[PDB]
Ligand binder design. Structure first.
Ligand SMILES: O=C(/C=C/C1CCN(CCc2c[nH]c3ccccc23)CC1)NO
Ligand SMILES: [K+]
Ligand SMILES: [K+]
Ligand SMILES: [Zn+2]
Length: 638
């Protein structure tokens, strides 16, 4: 299986610049590229990536997405002086040409195909291309908004032609609408395009009616274009995350893309003078993370906009950090999306309900500037510690390890005399393992998470949980698959309990979330809809310091467990301790692999049972006043 992350860059693409005064264009500078690469070298991240040489896109390749007439006209700009280059630029909207921009445009294009080839040939798992000029505004016969050729559109057309790909997801988190991408794929159901963007009721550039949420595609491609307009500036992490949990991820995991291309503009980051949003660079570590379980991790990130040289550097690093699998930063202060965002989110969901099954219940009323420096993100010495049953030896990935000092062994006796009596001398070894693994996770940056196999649940959960609280871990999120009650108090706001059961259980308070999904064929799609639209939004607002996973000895969800384990590592900087009751070679192989940061096997695209969606929306109704990040409609005033 593939390993590593590509980084495609070349100082040559910084060798074109604006040559006359023009305040429309004054912001697109060469320094964007060199600041971004220098931030990656300063943080050690460039050195950790496979450097892949840039190349030129050939003439045949440029014609995948552009007309001969336009290619011929651009081919002439290297022969042009400054008067002639100004005359040529004035024919297009918000774009300047330079003697060397045709050259760099072919480099920005070829660099993107270089990235597509490395990911699709399994030479890396994923990667990023720092390129200039950007692409996503470019159109079949026109330059637009600093873009000459449509790099991201090339990538999808090229991956279609040369790899026989059926499904390609393009995620455009630039703050501008990528209308060139939309035009190119509006009739193509094989490319799903998602774009959020500053719209301000069409008063923001490019001022297009088609940038609105009602453009869903055309013809055989309706439902594979999703526009999410931001109609106010100042959008926050909670707005961006709400867009992902309630619009983008439900749609993306059902589409099941074979490859993910990101138009990564960081003008949607705090401090940018074009986007004027308020999302912290760290959010891009999570935007990247939430997409990495798609398509076996095959993700190509292509740089677009980004104009505040400082936020630019930090958001680039948070993205590459997540591409290399480093632990994600904790996001604090999350809650409800703002009213304008909830209106936009609500309006997209309703128009898209004709096309996607996560939104289909909406259609019938039967069931309807300075900010703090981000912290350091070091990968653990050993990422994952595993404790299988005694004497069982397994094939472990290179970043895992097996696990009792005397310090820890006195503690187990201390606990035993007080609260248990019990003498089963190996469930006493399990609690030695639980404690020594927990001590390694929290006291150290050298171990990240861990999995322990246990036999007695309630004693194991008690010590795991109590040893985590009195450590201290501010909050613990507990995720439990099974039935019966455990020794967990949801009393204070220090524990939140997700439970996945089979018998229906009336919930009382807003610090427990109980999902009784009907067993059968639709169990897999229902679990994913709950994971994306209930569990992740609450977990993210709760902001736990530790995640405790617990599986009862019972099979039915061996298909979904790796996705959850991967996604849930967006909480608590990845510190998650999983207790498996009983030995299952394959469930344990699967848990360790997701915890180790390996690739997740895709699910493929069978729609969930309506009884299950009724159950999940009753849970949203019951929790969204305490947990605002669950909201995907505007609330009604008194
Ligand atoms: O991020 C990007 C970059 C997109 C660009 C889009 C176009 N505006 C130009 C703004 C503008 C239009 N008329 C003006 C008059 C005076 C001053 C300024 C302007 C700049 C950025 N693409 O992804
Ligand atoms: K966008
Ligand atoms: K499309
Ligand atoms: Zn932009």
């Amino acid at each position: 299986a593939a390993s590593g992350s590509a980084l495609i860059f070349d100082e040559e693409m910084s060798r074109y610049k604006l040559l006359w005064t023009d305040p429309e264009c004054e912001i697109e500078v060469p320094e964007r590229l060199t600041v971004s690469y220098e931030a990656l070298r300063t943080h050690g991240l460039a050195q950790r990536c496979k450097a892949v040489p840039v190349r030129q896109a050939t003439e045949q390749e440029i014609l995948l997405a552009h007309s001969e007439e336009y290619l011929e006209a651009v081919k002439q700009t290297p022969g042009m002086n400054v008067e002639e280059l100004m005359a040529f630029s004035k024919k297009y909207n918000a774009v300047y040409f330079h003697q060397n921009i045709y050259h760099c445009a072919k480099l920005a294009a070829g660099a993107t195909l270089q990235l597509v080839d490395s990911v699709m040939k399994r030479e890396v798992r994923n990667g990023m291309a720092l390129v200039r000029p950007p692409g996503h505004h470019s159109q079949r016969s026109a330059a637009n908004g600093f873009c000459v050729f449509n790099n991201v559109a090339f990538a999808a057309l090229y991956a279609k032609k040369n790899y026989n790909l059926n499904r390609i997801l393009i995620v455009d988190w630039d703050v501008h609408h990528g209308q060139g991408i939309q035009y190119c794929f509006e009739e193509d159901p094989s490319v799903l395009y998602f774009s959020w963007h500053r719209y301000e009721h069409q008063s923001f550039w490019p001022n297009l009616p088609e940038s609105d949420y009602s453009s869903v595609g055309k013809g055989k491609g309706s439902g594979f274009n999703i526009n999410l307009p931001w109609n106010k500036v100042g959008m926050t992490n909670s707005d961006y995350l709400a867009a992902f949990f309630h619009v983008l991820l439900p749609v993306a995991y059902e589409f099941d893309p074979e490859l993910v291309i990101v138009s990564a503009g960081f003008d949607s980051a705090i401090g940018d003078p074009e986007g004027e949003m308020c999302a912290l660079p760290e959010i891009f570590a999570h935007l990247t993370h939430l997409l990495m379980p798609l398509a076996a991790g095959k993700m190509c990130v292509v740089l677009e906009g980004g104009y505040n040289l400082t936020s630019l550097g930090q958001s680039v690093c948070q993205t590459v950090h997540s591409l290399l699998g480093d632990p994600t930063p904790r996001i604090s202060g999350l809650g409800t999306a703002c009213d304008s965002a909830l209106e936009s989110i609500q309006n997209v969901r309703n128009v898209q309900s004709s096309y996607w099954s996560s939104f289909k219940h909406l259609a019938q009323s039967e069931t309807n500037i300075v900010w703090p420096e981000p912290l350091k993100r070091m990968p653990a010495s050993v990422r994952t510690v595993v404790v299988p049953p005694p004497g069982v030896e397994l094939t472990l990935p290179k970043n895992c390890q097996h696990s009792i000092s005397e310090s820890t062994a006195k503690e187990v006796q201390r606990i035993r005399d007080k609260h248990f009596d019990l003498t089963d001398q190996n469930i006493l070894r399990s609690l030695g393992n639980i404690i020594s693994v927990l001590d390694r996770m929290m006291r150290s940056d050298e171990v990240c998470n861990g999995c322990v196999v246990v036999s007695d649940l309630s004693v194991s959960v008690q010590c795991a949980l109590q040893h985590a609280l009195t450590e201290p871990a501010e909050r613990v999120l507990v995720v439990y698959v099974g039935d019966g009650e455990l020794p967990v108090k949801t009393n204070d706001g220090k524990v939140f309990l997700v439970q996945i059961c089979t018998k229906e259980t009336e919930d009382k308070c807003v610090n427990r979330l109980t999902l009784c999904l009907r067993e059968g064929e639709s169990l897999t799609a229902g679990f994913m809809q709950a994971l994306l639209g209930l569990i992740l939004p609450v977990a993210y607002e709760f902001n736990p310091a530790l995640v405790l996973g617990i599986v009862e000895e019972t099979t039915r969800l061996m298909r979904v467990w790796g996705h959850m384990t991967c996604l849930i590592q967006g909480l608590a900087r990845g510190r998650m301790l999983t207790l498996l009751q009983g030995y299952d070679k394959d469930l344990l192989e699967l848990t360790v692999s997701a915890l180790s940061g390996a690739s997740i096997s895709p699910l493929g695209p069978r729609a969930p049972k309506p009884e299950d969606v009724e159950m999940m929306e009753k849970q949203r109704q019951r929790l969204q006043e305490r947990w605002g990040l669950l909201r995907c409609t505007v609330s009604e005033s008194w």
